[PDB]
From a paper:
However, because of the intrinsic flexibility and irregularity of loop regions, organizing multiple structured loops at protein functional sites has been very difficult to achieve by de novo protein design. Here we describe a solution to this problem that designs tandem repeat proteins with structured loops (9–14 residues) buttressed by extensive hydrogen bonding interactions. Experimental characterization shows that the designs are monodisperse, highly soluble, folded and thermally stable. Crystal structures are in close agreement with the design models, with the loops structured and buttressed as designed.
The in silico validated designs span a diverse range of shapes with different repeat protein curvatures and loop geometries and adopt multiple loop buttressing strategies using loop–helix hydrogen bond networks and loop–loop bidentate hydrogen bonds. From a fundamental design perspective, the crystal structures presented here show that computational protein design has advanced to the point that proteins with multiple ordered long loops can now be designed. Key to this success was the design of dense networks of hydrogen bonding and nonpolar interactions within and between the loops and between the loops and the underlying secondary structural elements.
Residue numbers in the entry: 1 to 205
Write the structure that this text describes.
Amino acid sequence: METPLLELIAIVRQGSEEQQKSALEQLKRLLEAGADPNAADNAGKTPLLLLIEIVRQGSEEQQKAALELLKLLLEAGADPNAADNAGKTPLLLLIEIVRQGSEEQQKAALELLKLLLEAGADPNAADNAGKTPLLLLIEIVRQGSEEQQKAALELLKLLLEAGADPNAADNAGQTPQQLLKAIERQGSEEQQKAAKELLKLLEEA
């Protein structure tokens, strides 16, 4: 399962700044010439997932290079829903970046998540514990910084307008409405006013 796309993404991940730039230009030319955007490495990691790992771990230059390449992969037809072997999906992984990333990483991930949803990512596809994107993003409202709270608010609205199940519960029974009311009880005045707006948005959906 070795291809030019995967070898070159490896150079974006590990090469010098000059090597990264040349690898990005070679990747675009391969994609433009029809290289398969879906052919995965020996671990079931897709080009999309591998470049999202670069957004999660890379320098500010690497995050920009990977954001550019991720947009081109999605325009090339990369499957926005394909998971790796451990069950990680691009939507879930990008939500992890919102939860743990720097302010620069959060912005990249917010831009990518919108592109992912426009490409057909499943807004209902959950992780192992059964947490939906909806639940995971409400957890960021609860525990994030003010800037994470704001991005999560934006993503939640875009996720409901993309058809997310307002009532879908996780494996333990937890619901978005349950979590939002806990934020209403325990959160800051800013969080309480956000959780109230989100409860009305949940019902309306």
